[PDB]
Amino acid sequence: HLPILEFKTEYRYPSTFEHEAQFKDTVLEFLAHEASDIIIKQGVAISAKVKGTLCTLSTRTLNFNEIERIALWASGSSSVLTELASKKLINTRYEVFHPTKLTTGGQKQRFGYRVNISPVYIQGKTTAEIVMRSIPLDPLPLADIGLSPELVNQMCPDNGIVMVAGKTSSGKSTTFSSIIRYIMENDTPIKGHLLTHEDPIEFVYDNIKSAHSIIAQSQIPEQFSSFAIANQEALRRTPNLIMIGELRDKQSIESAFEAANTGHPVFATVHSQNCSAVMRRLISRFDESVRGAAIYDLVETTRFIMAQTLVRKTDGNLVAAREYLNFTTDIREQLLSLSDMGKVASEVRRLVDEFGHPFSLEAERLHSDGIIDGHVAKRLSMMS
Amino acid sequence: LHLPILEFKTEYRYPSTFEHEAQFKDTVLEFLAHEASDIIIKQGVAISAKVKGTLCTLSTRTLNFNEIERIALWASGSSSVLTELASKKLINTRYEVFHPTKLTTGGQKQRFGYRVNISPVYIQGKTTAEIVMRSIPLDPLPLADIGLSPELVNQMCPDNGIVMVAGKTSSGKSTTFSSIIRYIMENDTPIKGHLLTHEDPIEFVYDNIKSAHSIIAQSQIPEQFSSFAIANQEALRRTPNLIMIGELRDKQSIESAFEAANTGHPVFATVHSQNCSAVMRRLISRFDESVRGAAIYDLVETTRFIMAQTLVRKTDGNLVAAREYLNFTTDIREQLLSLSDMGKVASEVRRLVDEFGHPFSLEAERLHSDGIIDGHVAKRLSMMS
């Protein structure tokens, strides 16, 4: 057995890897398949994740030398074997140029990758294994990622917290980047100063021209020790929008509460699988003594909850199925009038079914189109 | 002149004094000619190995603390290991010896794999190292050999969340997980792609496992990553489709499991626990009461499947694995969530394994009916674990 094998674009897989350009070229084929990530390790052919599956351009296997020089070309020095042996973590960036395709500004397009180089153990020896994660530049417009202007306007309140929920960075990052680019490109309730705080910063808005808004991005570990510090600082920064981060600590959730209650959009990401799961995860953070106050704040400040997952369409390629509830003034008024606040989670699950877009409905409507087969639809409906 | 048994030699003459690594590897190869399973190097006596359980040596000559120094350097990952010994660091690693005389494999070569304990000892008023290398299986074992049903292990390989096998140290969780991974990448399973394993001592290797859909990277955790925490921080930086992390032993390990799982990865964890309830209780106890609610919710929500396992000696005299397991479905998990009291979760889990899972009592009953275990053994299994 062997990994799935790609079809090339006028590119000759080398017998061997001696010339960096040799490597840039492979990288460029993998781009032409738009492979998101690229694993190079010994005893295996250079691999990438295309439409989420592992794929190779050859059956040749990297010898130790090939990998040794690649480690060099992938950003860093020839010290990288010692540096790995020095228990130093090798996380860098590597850019590649597209040969004849050009930027809107007459610039040769840059391609970013985040390269990690990690000790692995194979054929009895400690070698390097290198994973390069493609870096997006420009946010994708709504149509390309499948969100309608009508739907997105609901996610642009003048205050409160819009949460996108999900189980991987990529989906959330992309959705929120798209929604921001749309925000600054169109006439929305949200206008002005837009801060984003990003662990890895991914999308950039250098090429997004706005009539009415400016955007400032801060990478959090490098520039802002912590997200808490970044959000504390943002209030000194007259934001009209705060892309907060991951909303997993109690401190994070309460900071989101405070920012929303100072009256400017907070966009937050949540590692949960659906909207009720979002609610009950967020509630879980708080002790019972404070849990009522916390629930009131959460219901009153939340304006919109989107969970999404990625499902393979009929075509090999993937798509984002989305459940969302829009927290209308009606919805919030209902949720606040619950004799029992243990039920809020449950209640929200009800309400998403009543006035929202549940995963069952999304599976149903994608399946009504040729887009997802019945198995993927049933799986997605049980995401719920 | 009293001496342990010494072998008749195949291929080489014993060194005057161990200096070069190649002499030591050659000695290991001599022991292997005799099918030696374990090797003890200690100061007072000649390098010995256990052939068919009995101690033996290649020579009458004893070793100086110097050559025990050297040998310790060779077998261990680290340099100047004695300072690490006096730092009360536990030094278990792995050590490999390839066969000299073109003994090759079904493929291209043939390698022998060793689990190396180095332990502080006391000899003649001085602290020393004793070294012990146990030959350990190189390639993961098929499911049939470890007595797992493909259906069950498919049960245990979600797209996301935490799969835990609990047990005592001598219960071969590592073996179970290695089998489950080998099967993962040899068959069509929900989990496929980049699989990372972080292993203190790396035991099994996947060099000879051909996969249609998956690549595996193993990282040894003392020697290649300084800590498990670092390896798991790095794991997300890579593009993992499965992370075999460490033991879930302290708050930080459990939290790393939480992060990996919540960023959408299968997470394979071991727990030092006798049964599933005990696993839950133990993991929950790692967190302070202030954070322990959050920690509980995270724990129930990220867990997909819990296996406790023991090695019990069977009527034949050999030992097999008794397994109790619970599969955490959406229904099971939500039913764990929706308690009046969350402090009761552990209790609940007990209940639940009896109701929907494979408790130890059932497993002992079915082992005993097929005559695998003697009846006493079955009673012991039912009593607790």
CSV table of N, CA and C in Angstrom, one decimal, chain B residues 91-191:
chain,number,residue,atom,x,y,z
B,91,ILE,N,15.5,7.5,34.6
B,91,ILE,CA,16.1,7.4,33.2
B,91,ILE,C,15.7,6.1,32.6
B,92,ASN,N,14.6,6.1,31.9
B,92,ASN,CA,14.2,5.0,31.0
B,92,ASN,C,14.2,5.5,29.6
B,93,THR,N,14.9,4.9,28.7
B,93,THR,CA,15.0,5.2,27.3
B,93,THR,C,14.9,3.9,26.4
B,94,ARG,N,15.3,4.0,25.2
B,94,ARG,CA,15.3,2.9,24.2
B,94,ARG,C,16.6,2.9,23.5
B,95,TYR,N,17.0,1.7,23.1
B,95,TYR,CA,18.3,1.4,22.5
B,95,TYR,C,18.2,0.3,21.5
B,96,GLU,N,18.9,0.5,20.4
B,96,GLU,CA,18.7,-0.3,19.2
B,96,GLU,C,20.0,-0.8,18.7
B,97,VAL,N,20.0,-2.1,18.3
B,97,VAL,CA,21.2,-2.8,17.8
B,97,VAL,C,20.8,-3.5,16.5
B,98,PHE,N,21.4,-3.1,15.4
B,98,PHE,CA,21.2,-3.8,14.1
B,98,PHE,C,22.2,-4.9,13.9
B,99,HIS,N,21.7,-6.0,13.3
B,99,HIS,CA,22.5,-7.2,13.2
B,99,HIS,C,23.7,-7.0,12.3
B,100,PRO,N,24.9,-7.4,12.6
B,100,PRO,CA,26.1,-7.1,11.8
B,100,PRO,C,26.1,-7.8,10.5
B,101,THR,N,25.9,-9.1,10.6
B,101,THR,CA,26.2,-10.0,9.4
B,101,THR,C,25.0,-10.2,8.5
B,102,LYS,N,24.5,-9.0,8.1
B,102,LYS,CA,23.5,-9.0,7.0
B,102,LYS,C,22.4,-10.0,7.1
B,103,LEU,N,22.1,-10.4,8.3
B,103,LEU,CA,20.7,-10.7,8.7
B,103,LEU,C,19.8,-9.5,8.3
B,104,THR,N,19.1,-9.7,7.3
B,104,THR,CA,18.1,-8.7,6.8
B,104,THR,C,16.7,-9.2,7.1
B,105,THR,N,15.8,-8.2,7.0
B,105,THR,CA,14.4,-8.5,7.2
B,105,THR,C,13.7,-9.0,5.9
B,106,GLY,N,12.4,-9.3,6.0
B,106,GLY,CA,11.6,-9.4,4.8
B,106,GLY,C,11.8,-8.2,3.8
B,107,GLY,N,12.0,-7.0,4.3
B,107,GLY,CA,12.6,-5.9,3.5
B,107,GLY,C,14.1,-6.0,3.4
B,108,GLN,N,14.8,-5.1,4.1
B,108,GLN,CA,16.1,-4.8,3.8
B,108,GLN,C,17.1,-4.8,5.0
B,109,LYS,N,16.7,-5.0,6.2
B,109,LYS,CA,17.6,-5.0,7.3
B,109,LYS,C,16.8,-5.6,8.6
B,110,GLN,N,17.5,-5.7,9.7
B,110,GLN,CA,17.0,-6.4,10.8
B,110,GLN,C,17.6,-5.7,12.1
B,111,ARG,N,16.7,-5.2,13.0
B,111,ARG,CA,17.0,-4.4,14.1
B,111,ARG,C,16.4,-5.0,15.4
B,112,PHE,N,17.1,-4.8,16.5
B,112,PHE,CA,16.7,-5.3,17.8
B,112,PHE,C,16.6,-4.1,18.8
B,113,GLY,N,15.5,-4.2,19.5
B,113,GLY,CA,15.0,-3.0,20.2
B,113,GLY,C,14.9,-3.3,21.7
B,114,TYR,N,15.3,-2.3,22.5
B,114,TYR,CA,15.7,-2.5,23.9
B,114,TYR,C,15.1,-1.4,24.7
B,115,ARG,N,14.5,-1.7,25.9
B,115,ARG,CA,14.0,-0.7,26.8
B,115,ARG,C,15.1,-0.7,27.9
B,116,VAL,N,15.7,0.5,28.1
B,116,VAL,CA,16.8,0.7,29.0
B,116,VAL,C,16.4,1.5,30.2
B,117,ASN,N,16.3,0.8,31.3
B,117,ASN,CA,16.4,1.4,32.6
B,117,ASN,C,17.8,1.7,33.0
B,118,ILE,N,18.1,2.9,33.5
B,118,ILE,CA,19.3,3.1,34.3
B,118,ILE,C,18.8,3.6,35.7
B,119,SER,N,19.3,2.9,36.7
B,119,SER,CA,18.9,3.0,38.1
B,119,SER,C,20.1,3.3,39.0
B,120,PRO,N,19.9,4.3,39.9
B,120,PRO,CA,20.9,4.4,40.9
B,120,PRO,C,21.0,3.2,41.8
B,121,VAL,N,22.3,2.8,42.1
B,121,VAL,CA,22.6,1.7,43.0
B,121,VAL,C,23.7,2.2,44.0
B,122,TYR,N,24.0,1.4,45.0
B,122,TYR,CA,25.0,1.6,45.9
B,122,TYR,C,26.0,0.5,46.0
B,123,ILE,N,27.2,0.7,45.6
B,123,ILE,CA,28.3,-0.4,45.6
B,123,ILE,C,29.5,0.2,46.4
B,124,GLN,N,29.9,-0.5,47.4
B,124,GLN,CA,31.1,-0.3,48.1
B,124,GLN,C,31.2,1.2,48.5
B,125,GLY,N,30.2,1.8,49.0
B,125,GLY,CA,30.2,3.1,49.5
B,125,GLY,C,30.0,4.2,48.5
B,126,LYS,N,29.7,3.8,47.2
B,126,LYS,CA,29.7,4.8,46.1
B,126,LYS,C,28.4,4.6,45.4
B,127,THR,N,27.7,5.7,45.0
B,127,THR,CA,26.6,5.7,44.1
B,127,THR,C,27.0,5.3,42.7
B,128,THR,N,26.3,4.4,42.0
B,128,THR,CA,26.6,3.9,40.7
B,128,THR,C,25.3,3.9,39.9
B,129,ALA,N,25.4,3.6,38.6
B,129,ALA,CA,24.2,3.2,37.8
B,129,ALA,C,24.3,1.7,37.6
B,130,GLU,N,23.2,1.0,37.7
B,130,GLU,CA,22.9,-0.2,37.0
B,130,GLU,C,22.1,0.0,35.8
B,131,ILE,N,22.4,-0.7,34.7
B,131,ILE,CA,21.7,-0.6,33.4
B,131,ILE,C,21.0,-2.0,33.2
B,132,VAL,N,19.8,-1.9,32.8
B,132,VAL,CA,19.0,-3.1,32.3
B,132,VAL,C,18.4,-2.8,31.0
B,133,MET,N,18.6,-3.6,30.0
B,133,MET,CA,17.9,-3.5,28.7
B,133,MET,C,17.1,-4.7,28.5
B,134,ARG,N,15.8,-4.5,28.3
B,134,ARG,CA,14.9,-5.6,28.0
B,134,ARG,C,14.5,-5.5,26.5
B,135,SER,N,15.0,-6.4,25.7
B,135,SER,CA,14.4,-6.7,24.4
B,135,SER,C,12.9,-6.6,24.4
B,136,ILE,N,12.3,-5.7,23.5
B,136,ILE,CA,10.9,-5.5,23.5
B,136,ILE,C,10.4,-5.6,22.1
B,137,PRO,N,9.2,-6.1,21.8
B,137,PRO,CA,8.7,-6.2,20.5
B,137,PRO,C,8.9,-4.9,19.7
B,138,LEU,N,9.3,-5.1,18.4
B,138,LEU,CA,9.5,-3.9,17.6
B,138,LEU,C,8.3,-3.5,16.8
B,139,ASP,N,7.5,-4.4,16.3
B,139,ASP,CA,6.4,-4.1,15.5
B,139,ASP,C,5.1,-4.3,16.3
B,140,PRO,N,4.1,-3.4,16.2
B,140,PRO,CA,2.8,-3.6,16.9
B,140,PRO,C,2.2,-5.0,16.6
B,141,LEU,N,1.4,-5.4,17.5
B,141,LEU,CA,0.9,-6.8,17.4
B,141,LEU,C,-0.5,-6.7,16.8
B,142,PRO,N,-0.9,-7.6,15.9
B,142,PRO,CA,-2.3,-7.7,15.4
B,142,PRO,C,-3.3,-7.7,16.5
B,143,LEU,N,-4.5,-7.3,16.2
B,143,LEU,CA,-5.6,-7.4,17.2
B,143,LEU,C,-5.8,-8.8,17.8
B,144,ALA,N,-5.8,-9.8,16.9
B,144,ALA,CA,-6.1,-11.1,17.3
B,144,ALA,C,-5.1,-11.6,18.4
B,145,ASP,N,-3.9,-11.2,18.3
B,145,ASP,CA,-2.9,-11.6,19.3
B,145,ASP,C,-3.1,-11.0,20.6
B,146,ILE,N,-3.6,-9.8,20.7
B,146,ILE,CA,-3.9,-9.1,22.0
B,146,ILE,C,-5.4,-9.2,22.3
B,147,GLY,N,-6.2,-9.9,21.5
B,147,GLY,CA,-7.6,-10.2,21.8
B,147,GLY,C,-8.5,-9.1,21.8
B,148,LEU,N,-8.4,-8.2,20.8
B,148,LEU,CA,-9.3,-7.1,20.6
B,148,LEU,C,-10.1,-7.4,19.3
B,149,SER,N,-11.4,-7.1,19.4
B,149,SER,CA,-12.2,-7.2,18.2
B,149,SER,C,-12.2,-6.0,17.3
B,150,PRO,N,-12.0,-6.1,16.0
B,150,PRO,CA,-12.0,-4.9,15.1
B,150,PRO,C,-13.2,-4.1,15.4
B,151,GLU,N,-14.4,-4.7,15.5
B,151,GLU,CA,-15.6,-3.9,15.8
B,151,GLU,C,-15.4,-3.0,17.0
B,152,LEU,N,-14.9,-3.5,18.1
B,152,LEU,CA,-14.7,-2.7,19.3
B,152,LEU,C,-13.7,-1.6,19.1
B,153,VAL,N,-12.6,-1.8,18.4
B,153,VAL,CA,-11.6,-0.8,18.3
B,153,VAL,C,-12.1,0.3,17.3
B,154,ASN,N,-12.7,-0.1,16.2
B,154,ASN,CA,-13.6,0.9,15.5
B,154,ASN,C,-14.5,1.7,16.4
B,155,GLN,N,-15.1,1.0,17.4
B,155,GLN,CA,-15.8,1.7,18.4
B,155,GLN,C,-15.0,2.8,19.1
B,156,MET,N,-13.7,2.7,19.1
B,156,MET,CA,-12.9,3.5,20.0
B,156,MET,C,-12.1,4.5,19.3
B,157,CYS,N,-12.3,4.7,18.0
B,157,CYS,CA,-11.5,5.6,17.2
B,157,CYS,C,-12.5,6.7,16.6
B,158,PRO,N,-12.9,7.6,17.4
B,158,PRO,CA,-13.7,8.7,16.9
B,158,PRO,C,-13.0,9.6,15.9
B,159,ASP,N,-13.7,10.6,15.3
B,159,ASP,CA,-13.0,11.7,14.7
B,159,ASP,C,-12.4,12.6,15.7
B,160,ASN,N,-13.0,12.8,16.9
B,160,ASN,CA,-12.4,13.7,17.8
B,160,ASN,C,-12.6,13.2,19.3
B,161,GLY,N,-12.1,13.9,20.2
B,161,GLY,CA,-12.2,13.5,21.6
B,161,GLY,C,-11.1,12.7,22.1
B,162,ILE,N,-11.2,12.1,23.3
B,162,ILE,CA,-10.2,11.4,24.0
B,162,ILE,C,-10.6,10.0,24.2
B,163,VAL,N,-9.7,9.1,23.7
B,163,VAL,CA,-9.8,7.7,24.0
B,163,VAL,C,-8.7,7.3,25.0
B,164,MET,N,-9.1,6.8,26.2
B,164,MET,CA,-8.2,6.5,27.3
B,164,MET,C,-8.3,5.0,27.5
B,165,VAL,N,-7.1,4.3,27.6
B,165,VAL,CA,-7.0,3.0,28.2
B,165,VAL,C,-6.3,3.2,29.5
B,166,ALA,N,-7.0,2.8,30.6
B,166,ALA,CA,-6.5,2.8,31.9
B,166,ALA,C,-6.0,1.4,32.4
B,167,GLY,N,-5.2,1.4,33.4
B,167,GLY,CA,-4.6,0.2,33.9
B,167,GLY,C,-3.4,0.4,34.7
B,168,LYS,N,-2.9,-0.7,35.3
B,168,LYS,CA,-1.6,-0.7,36.0
B,168,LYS,C,-0.4,-0.6,35.1
B,169,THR,N,0.7,-0.2,35.6
B,169,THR,CA,1.9,-0.1,34.7
B,169,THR,C,2.2,-1.3,33.9
B,170,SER,N,2.0,-2.5,34.6
B,170,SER,CA,2.3,-3.8,34.0
B,170,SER,C,1.2,-4.4,33.2
B,171,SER,N,0.2,-3.6,32.8
B,171,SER,CA,-1.0,-4.1,32.1
B,171,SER,C,-1.0,-3.8,30.6
B,172,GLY,N,0.1,-3.4,30.0
B,172,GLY,CA,0.3,-3.3,28.6
B,172,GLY,C,-0.8,-2.4,27.9
B,173,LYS,N,-1.0,-1.2,28.4
B,173,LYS,CA,-1.7,-0.2,27.7
B,173,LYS,C,-1.0,0.2,26.5
B,174,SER,N,0.3,0.4,26.6
B,174,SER,CA,1.1,0.7,25.4
B,174,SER,C,0.9,-0.3,24.3
B,175,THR,N,0.9,-1.6,24.6
B,175,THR,CA,0.7,-2.6,23.6
B,175,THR,C,-0.7,-2.4,22.9
B,176,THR,N,-1.7,-2.3,23.7
B,176,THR,CA,-3.1,-2.0,23.2
B,176,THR,C,-3.1,-0.9,22.2
B,177,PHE,N,-2.5,0.2,22.6
B,177,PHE,CA,-2.5,1.4,21.8
B,177,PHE,C,-1.7,1.3,20.5
B,178,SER,N,-0.6,0.6,20.6
B,178,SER,CA,0.2,0.3,19.4
B,178,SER,C,-0.6,-0.5,18.4
B,179,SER,N,-1.2,-1.6,18.9
B,179,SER,CA,-2.1,-2.4,18.1
B,179,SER,C,-3.2,-1.6,17.5
B,180,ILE,N,-3.8,-0.7,18.3
B,180,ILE,CA,-4.9,0.1,17.8
B,180,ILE,C,-4.4,1.1,16.7
B,181,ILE,N,-3.2,1.6,16.8
B,181,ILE,CA,-2.7,2.5,15.8
B,181,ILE,C,-2.3,1.7,14.5
B,182,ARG,N,-1.5,0.7,14.6
B,182,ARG,CA,-1.2,-0.2,13.5
B,182,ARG,C,-2.5,-0.5,12.7
B,183,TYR,N,-3.5,-1.0,13.4
B,183,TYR,CA,-4.8,-1.3,12.8
B,183,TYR,C,-5.4,0.0,12.2
B,184,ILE,N,-5.2,1.1,12.9
B,184,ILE,CA,-5.8,2.4,12.4
B,184,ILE,C,-5.3,2.7,11.0
B,185,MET,N,-3.9,2.6,10.8
B,185,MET,CA,-3.3,3.0,9.5
B,185,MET,C,-3.3,1.8,8.5
B,186,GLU,N,-3.5,0.6,8.9
B,186,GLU,CA,-3.6,-0.5,8.0
B,186,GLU,C,-5.0,-0.8,7.5
B,187,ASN,N,-6.0,-0.2,8.1
B,187,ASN,CA,-7.4,-0.4,7.7
B,187,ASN,C,-8.1,0.9,7.4
B,188,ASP,N,-9.3,0.9,6.9
B,188,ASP,CA,-10.1,2.1,6.6
B,188,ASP,C,-10.9,2.4,7.9
B,189,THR,N,-10.5,3.5,8.5
B,189,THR,CA,-11.0,3.9,9.8
B,189,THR,C,-11.4,5.4,9.8
B,190,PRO,N,-12.3,5.8,10.7
B,190,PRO,CA,-12.7,7.2,10.7
B,190,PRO,C,-11.5,8.1,10.9
B,191,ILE,N,-10.5,7.7,11.6
B,191,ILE,CA,-9.3,8.5,11.8
B,191,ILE,C,-8.2,8.1,10.8
